[PDB]
Design a binder for this molecule. Sequence first.
Ligand SMILES: Cn1ncc(-c2ccc3c(=O)[nH]nc(C[NH3+])c3c2)c1-c1c(F)c(Cl)cc(OC2CC2)c1C#N
Ligand SMILES: CSC[C@H]1O[C@@H](n2cnc3c(N)ncnc32)[C@H](O)[C@@H]1O
Lengths: 625, 302
Amino acid sequence: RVSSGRDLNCVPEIADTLGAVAKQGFDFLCMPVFHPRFKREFIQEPAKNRPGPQTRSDLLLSGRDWNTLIVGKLSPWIRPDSKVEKIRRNSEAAMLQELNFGAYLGLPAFLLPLNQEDNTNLARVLTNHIHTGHHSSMFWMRVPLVAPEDLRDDIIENAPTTHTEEYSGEEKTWMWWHNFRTLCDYSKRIAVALEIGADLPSNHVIDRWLGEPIKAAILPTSIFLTNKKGFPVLSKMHQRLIFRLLKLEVQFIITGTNHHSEKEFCSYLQYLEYLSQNRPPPNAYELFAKGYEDYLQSPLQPLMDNLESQTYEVFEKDPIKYSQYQQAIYKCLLDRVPEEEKDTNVQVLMVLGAGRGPLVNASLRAAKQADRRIKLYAVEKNPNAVVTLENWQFEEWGSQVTVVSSDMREWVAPEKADIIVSELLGSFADNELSPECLDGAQHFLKDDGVSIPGEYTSFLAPISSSKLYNEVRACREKDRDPEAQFEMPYVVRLHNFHQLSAPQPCFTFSHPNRDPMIDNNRYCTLEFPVEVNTVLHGFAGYFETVLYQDITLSIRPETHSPGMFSWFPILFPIKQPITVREGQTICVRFWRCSNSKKVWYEWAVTAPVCSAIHNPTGRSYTIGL
Amino acid sequence: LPPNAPACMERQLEAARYRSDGALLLGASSLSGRCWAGSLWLFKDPCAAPNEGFCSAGVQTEAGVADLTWVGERGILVASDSGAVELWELDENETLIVSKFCKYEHDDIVSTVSVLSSGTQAVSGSKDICIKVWDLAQQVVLSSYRAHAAQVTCVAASPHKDSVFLSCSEDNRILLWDTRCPKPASQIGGYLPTSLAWHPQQSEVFVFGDENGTVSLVDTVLSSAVHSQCVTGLVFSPHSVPFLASLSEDCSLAVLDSSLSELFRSQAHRDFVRDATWSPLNHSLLTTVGWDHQVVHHVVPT
Ligand SMILES: Cn1ncc(-c2ccc3c(=O)[nH]nc(C[NH3+])c3c2)c1-c1c(F)c(Cl)cc(OC2CC2)c1C#N
Ligand SMILES: CSC[C@H]1O[C@@H](n2cnc3c(N)ncnc32)[C@H](O)[C@@H]1O
């Protein structure tokens, strides 16, 4: 199921055209709202007095059709950045006219070209139009992977084409887009319509568009090959790009005339459909989180807040996660109770943060398969979940499990535990204050007691994503710091982004913490070798944890626990994007700060340039103790 | 009101070309309104145009007529908005205009077309940035060149060299072509060029106008600020010492001499001036058409 559109520059009649387009299998049509060659004068007589009508009548389509089927196209003669003043004036007036007519029709999107380096005036006119009434209409900037000048035939004898590699030069079109949208102050209504050429550029040029708001891919019919049967197809390299683009769920646009005249025109579209049908999405985890892609979420604070019923449900819908706990407990019971003591040695297990009881059951299943005896405590401070635990305890668990409705830091245990099990970790590992909770519960762990998890570590990686930068930016609220949205982390299924360096460890914690001088504050410096030209918008966070020995949990991509759904990555944004060149190093600083009330993070970028310190004194974000 | 001839002719007139005997060929486009199409007309009586009821022949085209040109005495080569190059031919009776072939080879609007010396091949320019060499007999594209980096504004075949022709584009290139060379294009040394015209009596000499209203005489430099807007076209007169007619988007027609000096000025048009054609019978009569639907017959003082 591919959403595709047909691009035309010639429409003798809208009704007939739209019908032929729909019958061929297209979802929408890109067409001009004024005739492409109908140049119009606005200042000098007598041409400015040309009698109307200036274009077609809106009555030729229903309101619903204009809203859903038509994509307007700026007339190609409109050149706001022409070096001739007269042409700039006329183009400005014509641009507003055509744009306003598009808004008049309620068109869902409008196509404007980025076919040169200087589009300053073009951006000004567009920006002016955007700030003339609040509308949801989109603007698709048509920009090619490879500038036409950089793909022209080498047929000019006295002006040969370049044959030496110009790394940055081959990325020029991205700079066209970057400057245009920066001039437009990152307007959420301005997206990319990436046009694919017959010959693809280097991978770095293509990767440049990672994280950009690509809404459409344009495929000219002239890039398609021809198989034995005579149908249009694509090279394996182009197929590789189409597959990457399907992961972004862009809308594909077919432009150009039919060059495979032996076959009908839906042939090009059929190939897209065919390619769409031929791909593989990892079981569940890509099923699972397809709806949560780039969706910002507030990180849980299960300590300061009491989690809702369906939030625990989400925790429990991950069997791989808890079977890892079961195995971790299993291995530990055998290591602590020799075979000859399997009937006399009863181990005291304590779930610290039992929720609705998935760890409790995992502990029971662990003792069975290990053929050992355990005495269970189910500690949980969220009283609403203690309702679930105690109904479980009366109906099933029985006297073997003791539910304790208390905070693990204040609970006065009647005895000491052989094994404490906890699931107090967040996307950034310690961002829910698992160190502080386990520290306060440490007194009722035996001198040889084991803590599961035994240790965890958080990882950071610089990412580029103008899309996510805009979503964070859009999170301004009425009665707080206008920039507070940049000084707090978000749990998000990072999708449309580009990871600029390999993740590196940030903060690590061990339990039990035998050290006499426990200090959970942290200060870490990281240097990320970046081998590409990009723009830094934030840092992605992951975590790894050791439940016991070799049994582990991880959302770090290179060591991701296969099949585990729980825990999306966390995102630490930065107020201002930072340009980074190839070979430069990104130096980031992170602090874990705390007082008696709150714990929080502070971060700053020191290379290649200095950012402001983010979330100083937890002014914008703190974690409740 | 000949047969299979539309009752109404489109408003925007784009092409006007005389032939040997003196019949006038008209190309019209509908650049606004419900239907955006075009048409072709033949006026054996040039004074009866653009009246449709007193024309020799006529026919409707599927899309607009961006540019056209004669192919001999009965052939018409059309640059269509649909991205196709069309060849129409009059019947033996010259009362019907029939479509000979319509090939969709360009991926965008075909804006310019020109017939080469031999009269058996033609070169076309399009907004898809391509330039194609056509075999009118085999109805196929012999060569497709992507030498420019922007729209191809104008392509003009050499008068007597069948392998040479000019082209200009919005990439600010003026390319002299010689398909006899391995690399057939050559960049000839401002504002964007918009029109081309070879000299009929001098091999290596041509003129070209720019988007700023300047006309320039170039040997393979003399120039003059002729117009206040884009120079749409340049047509040399058939005289032994020819005159130069320049039309522009400023709604004016100019007639220049050997040194680009102005000898005549017409403002009869109220809209853009799209073409100009000299009468083969009366050398001092110059016909122009424009988007004001006017067919003006100028008497140029010589
Ligand atoms: C938004 N957010 N922040 C943190 C978490 C989360 C997720 C899973 C676990 C877990 O399995 N154990 N322990 C903890 C805490 N110790 C936990 C914490 C989430 C979160 C959430 F609270 C909900 Cl309701 C849904 C989520 O994503 C679903 C759609 C895929 C997430 C995430 N990510
Ligand atoms: C499975 S998510 C973390 C679980 O542990 C609980 N929890 C967090 N902190 C504490 C604490 N200090 N004492 C007891 N339970 C806790 C939370 O209420 C939640 O159910």
